[PDB]
Amino acid sequence: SNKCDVVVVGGGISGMAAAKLLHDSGLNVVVLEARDRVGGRTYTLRNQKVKYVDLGGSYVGPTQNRILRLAKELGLETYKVNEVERLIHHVKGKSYPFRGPFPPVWNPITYLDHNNFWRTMDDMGREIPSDAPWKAPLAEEWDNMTMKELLDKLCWTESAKQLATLFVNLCVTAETHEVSALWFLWYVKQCGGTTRIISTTNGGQERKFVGGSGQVSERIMDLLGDRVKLERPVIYIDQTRENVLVETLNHEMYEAKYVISAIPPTLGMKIHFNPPLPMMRNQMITRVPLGSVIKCIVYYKEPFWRKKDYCGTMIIDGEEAPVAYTLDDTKPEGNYAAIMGFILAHKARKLARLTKEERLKKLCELYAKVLGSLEALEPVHYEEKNWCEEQYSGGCYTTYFPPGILTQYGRVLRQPVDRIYFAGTETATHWSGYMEGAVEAGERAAREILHAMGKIPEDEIWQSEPESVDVPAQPITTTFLERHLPSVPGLLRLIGLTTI
Amino acid sequence: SNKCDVVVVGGGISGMAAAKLLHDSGLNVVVLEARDRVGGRTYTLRNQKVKYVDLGGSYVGPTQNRILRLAKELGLETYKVNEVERLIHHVKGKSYPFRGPFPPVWNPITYLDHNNFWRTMDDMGREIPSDAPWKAPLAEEWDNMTMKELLDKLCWTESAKQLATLFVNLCVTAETHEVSALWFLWYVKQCGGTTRIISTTNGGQERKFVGGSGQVSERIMDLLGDRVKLERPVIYIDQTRENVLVETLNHEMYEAKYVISAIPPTLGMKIHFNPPLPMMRNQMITRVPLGSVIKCIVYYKEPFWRKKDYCGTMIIDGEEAPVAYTLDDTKPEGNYAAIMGFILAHKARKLARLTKEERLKKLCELYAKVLGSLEALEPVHYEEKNWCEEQYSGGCYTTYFPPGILTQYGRVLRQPVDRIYFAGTETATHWSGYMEGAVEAGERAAREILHAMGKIPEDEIWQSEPESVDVPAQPITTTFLERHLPSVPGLLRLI
Numbered sequence: 001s002n003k004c005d006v007v008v009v010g011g012g013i014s015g016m017a018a019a020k021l022l023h024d025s026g027l028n029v030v031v032l033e034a035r036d037r038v039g040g041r042t043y044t045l046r047n048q049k050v051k052y053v054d055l056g057g058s059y060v061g062p063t064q065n066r067i068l069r070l071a072k073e074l075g076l077e078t079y080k081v082n083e084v085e086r087l088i089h090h091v092k093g094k095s096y097p098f099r100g101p102f103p104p105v106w107n108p109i110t111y112l113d114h115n116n117f118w119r120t121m122d123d124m125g126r127e128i129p130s131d132a133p134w135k136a137p138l139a140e141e142w143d144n145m146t147m148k149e150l151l152d153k154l155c156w157t158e159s160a161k162q163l164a165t166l167f168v169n170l171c172v173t174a175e176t177h178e179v180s181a182l183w184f185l186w187y188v189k190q191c192g193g194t195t196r197i198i199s200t201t202n203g204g205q206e207r208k209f210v211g212g213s214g215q216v217s218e219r220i221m222d223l224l225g226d227r228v229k230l231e232r233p234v235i236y237i238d239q240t241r242e243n244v245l246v247e248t249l250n251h252e253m254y255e256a257k258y259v260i261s262a263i264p265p266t267l268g269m270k271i272h273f274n275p276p277l278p279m280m281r282n283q284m285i286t287r288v289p290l291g292s293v294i295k296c297i298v299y300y301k302e303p304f305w306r307k308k309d310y311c312g313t314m315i316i317d318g319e320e321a322p323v324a325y326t327l328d329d330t331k332p333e334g335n336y337a338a339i340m341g342f343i344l345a346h347k348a349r350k351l352a353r354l355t356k357e358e359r360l361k362k363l364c365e366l367y368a369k370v371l372g373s374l375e376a377l378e379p380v381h382y383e384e385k386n387w388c389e390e391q392y393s394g395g396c397y398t399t400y401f402p403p404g405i406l407t408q409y410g411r412v413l414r415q416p417v418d419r420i421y422f423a424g425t426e427t428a429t430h431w432s433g434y435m436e437g438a439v440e441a442g443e444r445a446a447r448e449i450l451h452a453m454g455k456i457p458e459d460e461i462w463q464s465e466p467e468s469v470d471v472p473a474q475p476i477t478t479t480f481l482e483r484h485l486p487s488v489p490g491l492l493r494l495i496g497l498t499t500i
Numbered sequence: 501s502n503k504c505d506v507v508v509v510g511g512g513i514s515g516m517a518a519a520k521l522l523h524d525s526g527l528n529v530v531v532l533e534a535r536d537r538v539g540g541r542t543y544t545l546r547n548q549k550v551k552y553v554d555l556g557g558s559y560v561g562p563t564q565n566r567i568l569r570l571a572k573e574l575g576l577e578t579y580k581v582n583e584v585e586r587l588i589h590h591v592k593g594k595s596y597p598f599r600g601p602f603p604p605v606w607n608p609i610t611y612l613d614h615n616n617f618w619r620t621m622d623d624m625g626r627e628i629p630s631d632a633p634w635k636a637p638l639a640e641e642w643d644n645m646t647m648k649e650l651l652d653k654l655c656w657t658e659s660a661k662q663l664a665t666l667f668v669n670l671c672v673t674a675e676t677h678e679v680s681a682l683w684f685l686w687y688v689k690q691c692g693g694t695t696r697i698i699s700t701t702n703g704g705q706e707r708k709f710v711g712g713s714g715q716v717s718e719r720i721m722d723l724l725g726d727r728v729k730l731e732r733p734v735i736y737i738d739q740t741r742e743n744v745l746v747e748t749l750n751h752e753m754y755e756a757k758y759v760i761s762a763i764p765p766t767l768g769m770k771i772h773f774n775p776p777l778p779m780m781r782n783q784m785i786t787r788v789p790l791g792s793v794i795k796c797i798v799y800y801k802e803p804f805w806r807k808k809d810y811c812g813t814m815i816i817d818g819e820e821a822p823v824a825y826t827l828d829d830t831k832p833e834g835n836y837a838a839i840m841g842f843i844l845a846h847k848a849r850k851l852a853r854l855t856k857e858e859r860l861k862k863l864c865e866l867y868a869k870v871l872g873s874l875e876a877l878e879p880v881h882y883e884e885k886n887w888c889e890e891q892y893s894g895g896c897y898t899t900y901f902p903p904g905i906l907t908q909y910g911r912v913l914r915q916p917v918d919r920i921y922f923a924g925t926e927t928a929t930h931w932s933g934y935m936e937g938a939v940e941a942g943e944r945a946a947r948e949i950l951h952a953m954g955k956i957p958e959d960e961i962w963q964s965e966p967e968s969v970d971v972p973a974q975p976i977t978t979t980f981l982e983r984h985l986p987s988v989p990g991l992l993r994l995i
């Protein structure tokens with residue numbers, strides 16, 4: 001066997017952050033990575049037509065201070081996603097340009113319903129502890145409904161229900177009927193709430209890394225040298241003896257004091273355990289699927305949309321639209337003009353049947369209509385990745401919880417199993433599902449092992465992160481009217497009382 | 501490498517039934533079984549205290565002609581589950597004895613509501629094709645709601661909603677909010693409907709095998725001999741070369757022309773595939789959990805409940821009861837007297853933390869209350885099995901589909917992947933979830949390979965089964981009033 005202190009299973013950002021912390025603390029680490037590359041759900045493609053493109057995780061923003069600190073220490077820099085010109089909301093076959101993070105509503109009744117929808121998502125979120133969502137006072141009631149059921153109760157207008165549906169589909173690459181309401185409300189609150197999660201400027205989609213996010217995992221592999229073993233899918237973990245034994249598919253055995261599992265929870269099923277996992281984890285890892293998304297980047301000669309005072313952001317409602325959301329993906333130098341779009345949830349399954357050329361044609365026709373621009377029919381290059389086909393991801397962006405699962409099984413997501421500790425973005429408490437959460441979880445799992453070894457005290461396991469000096473976070477604020485305007489049923493109760 | 505015609509992954513009833521059919525046709529088969537035993541979600545324990553006890557699947561009944569025929573060929577006999585005396589429905593802390601399969605209602609409004617609930621489950625089932633539930637005319641609408649949401653819509657009384665809840669929990673060992681309404685309605689319809697699935701006499705729980713259901717898998721292993729490889733968990737399947745390569749955790753390599761996957765769909769995740777699975781199967785096998793149950797058998801000196809004209813069936817409402825449903829587990833001679841109970845769904849998760857002795861005390865005190873007998877407090881033995889803990893099952897009885905999954909991914913369950921064909925009870929079209937479905941699916945997957953080999957024509961892949969002579973089915977009937985009484989909102993529209 002190859003002997004070390006800690007085997008890290010998985011060389012995504014989470015495993016690589018865990019391994020780096022352990023290596024920096026003076027332990028002997030090995031990373032066992034299934035693929036011929038590091039980065040996992042991040043993947044930066046390089047070729048002469050695109051220079052570089054993120055086909056996986058890409059965006060970082062204010063309050064994501066751990067990924068910003070890690071990337072900065074590795075010599076990386078960010079740039080701002082283009083949001084100079086107008087956003088577009090495309091609904092019922094027409095485009096409505098706007099500014100500010102939320103598409104505006106003019107109809108007074110529709111305005112109360114929209115305002116109440118976002119307000120109520122955050123009001124419910126404030127009842128949910130980030131580190132223990134199952135402790136919310138109505139956890140059971142909220143976990144036993146889908147997001148579809150919650151929207152049917154909350155939204156008194158079709159306008160608000162349709163926009164809320166797109167919000168769920170885009171945030172968690174799943175249908176409203178697929179996901180627990182408790183879990184979704186937790187997921188949004190642990191990113192800092194509705195405004196922070198949806199925003200480009202001042203939110204999650206503010207920035208990208210110059211040269212691609214895959215550099216985070218690659219530059220850590222460079223620091224670790226031959227400690228990263230590529231094409232070593234882990235098949236077996238045996239904790240019955242004094243040291244843990246970890247076996248790979250390519251017939252190698254690693255011996256360690258502790259293991260960090262840094263893979264999506266359900267991909268733990270690809271490992272045979274001796275002794276068997278405890279009942280709750282054994283069943284949990286069959287109950288937690290990942291979402292479905294194709295990330296598609298269409299290249300153009302020039303960022304022509306900016307000449308029409310459009311930034312490239314399109315929020316597109318409607319079953320026929322393949323893509324519900326786009327961002328400008330033009331390089332910071334202004335060249336390699338491109339539109340990034342997501343094909344979400346059922347559409348990632350429905351349109352996976354088409355050829356690459358057929359998907360490009362449908363996307364160009366959609367963009368031509370939404371942008372009112374024949375130039376959108378003149379692409380120069382196309383790249384795409386359907387994350388649903390990845391054996392060693394299971395989907396993207398992250399793991400969702402169907403109704404009933406988070407209250408029954410969520411307590412064991414990051415509960416150690418003897419000498420196995422659990423990393424991966426799914427186990428984070430702040431920007432779980434993101435590159436930020438991957439760093440939080442990898443460093444927390446590593447510190448749990450440092451504590452087990454008597455190297456640090458228990459109060460150093462969870463560590464706060466200083467605010468980025470490069471990416472300052474503007475606070476989330478509301479107006480008096482946003483806070484106190486009635487809901488639709490609130491207004492009807494007021495009318496009822498006046499008339500009585 | 502060990503060379504054969506077909507490798508069957510899994511030595512449950514489905515894999516054993518598939519391997520027996522291929523063997524009988526003259527092919528060289530190997531069965532690779534992860535555990536140190538065969539039988540999978542069937543497990544018969546033998547000891548002097550119980551003689552034998554089914555800790556997994558046990559019951560068979562009319563219309564399950566394939567498991568009855570296979571068991572009869574292997575030399576097995578059935579006996580009837582005791583239903584001579586009265587059933588009990590325990591409601592709001594009191595026992596109400598009854599006869600007939602459905603617990604009766606006396607309040608006129610509650611009566612209409614209960615009648616409508618069962619009738620409506622079967623009306624909806626008649627629009628769901630057994631072999632393609634995703635082709636139901638309302639497939640998306642019904643797949644996008646949980647059973648909890650359907651029961652909220654349908655049930656005007658708490659009485660009906662709570663008994664419907666017990667029905668779901670008992671049939672599919674899952675909460676109403678965990679499961680798709682389309683999938684659950686399919687599940688009931690593909691067992692022959694509400695009457696057939698809930699009934700002991702003339703239904704799914706009519707009979708047990710003399711000596712235990714484990715003998716089905718054990719006696720096929722006896723026939724196959726050293727073709728069955730125990731403690732061979734499959735870790736890797738490679739389809740890139742002329743022959744399929746199957747690798748096990750204990751470092752053995754098998755080469756075959758074809759493979760049958762006879763494991764629960766989600767346990768496909770324990771295998772690394774080269775080339776990778778197609779996208780839809782890759783995601784499907786992450787979306788299909790199994791239910792949660794503890795099967796508990798309390799032994800007594802005598803079947804003392806029979807003296808009070810109770811058969812031992814208990815239907816026990818409410819959150820506090822650990823067990824919602826029991827059957828008499830006494831042997832056909834009246835000895836090894838016992839009550840079988842299930843701890844279902846969230847209760848299996850909640851009560852798993854207790855000791856075996858703590859569960860025994862809770863069950864005995866519940867049974868004393870429900871049977872109104874102090875005799876229930878004097879057990880002579882106890883056996884139990886928590887199926888949630890099994891690495892190579894994932895739970896029991898079967899796989900459930902959460903909302904949205906059956907319409908998006910259902911078509912992929914039995915779609916071959918190059919030279920891998922899919923067996924397992926989850927792929928059956930009649931009593932999927934049962935030992936009957938295990939036999940149907942194993943034999944169908946085996947005949948798909950015989951067709952691939954040019955040995956049989958396409959029309960022989962799916963084969964009908966003659967009715968058992970020993971366990972004939974009687975018709976399910978309804979009354980004029982059951983068919984035509986209004987629903988509660990129906991009685992209101994007339995007002």
Ligand SMILES: *Cc1cc2c(cc1C)nc1c(=O)[nH]c(=O)nc-1n2C[C@H](O)[C@H](O)[C@H](O)COP(=O)(O)OP(=O)(O)OC[C@H]1O[C@@H](n2cnc3c(N)ncnc32)[C@H](O)[C@@H]1O
Binds near residue numbers: 435
């Ligand atoms: C895919 C995707 C993700 C994504 C996104 C868009 C798409 C299309 N948008 C994001 C964004 O703009 N900003 C952001 O912060 N996140 C975004 N996401 C999510 C993000 O990519 C993920 O949250 C993050 O990358 C997850 O990191 P983590 O380290 O937790 O997980 P991983 O990347 O999946 O890495 C796991 C590794 O383990 C290997 N593996 C899997 N099984 C095994 C076995 N058995 N043995 C050994 N290694 C294994 C995987 O190959 C992977 O490298």
Ligand SMILES: *Cc1cc2c(cc1C)nc1c(=O)[nH]c(=O)nc-1n2C[C@H](O)[C@H](O)[C@H](O)COP(=O)(O)OP(=O)(O)OC[C@H]1O[C@@H](n2cnc3c(N)ncnc32)[C@H](O)[C@@H]1O
Binds near residue numbers: 515538539555559733
């Ligand atoms: C558990 C249970 C099941 C059950 C029930 C009560 C309980 C507590 N009551 C039933 C009843 O009264 N009547 C009835 O007809 N069914 C009842 N059920 C369900 C029934 O037991 C199942 O439907 C049936 O046994 C399923 O058979 P099938 O052959 O489809 O599946 P299996 O038994 O799970 O067998 C799978 C085998 O595969 C092995 N395995 C798993 N992974 C691997 C790997 N990687 N490699 C090799 N082998 C593998 C398993 O160990 C198993 O033997």
Ligand SMILES: O=C(/[C]=[C]/C1=[C][C]=C2O=[C]OC2=[C]1)C1=[C][C]=[C]C(C(F)(F)F)=[C]1
Binds near residue numbers: 197
């Ligand atoms: O929810 C939104 C974006 C979420 C988002 C967008 C990209 C992501 O990449 C990984 O996680 C991601 C989350 C959103 C953006 C603009 C407008 C709206 C609104 F308001 F619903 F229209 C929602």
Ligand SMILES: O=C(/[C]=[C]/C1=[C][C]=C2O=[C]OC2=[C]1)C1=[C][C]=[C]C(C(F)(F)F)=[C]1
Binds near residue numbers: 670704
């Ligand atoms: O649904 C019922 C039984 C199902 C059943 C009982 C045992 C089983 O073992 C494997 O599948 C099984 C299914 C049932 C039986 C009597 C009454 C009721 C009722 F009516 F809901 F209470 C339900």
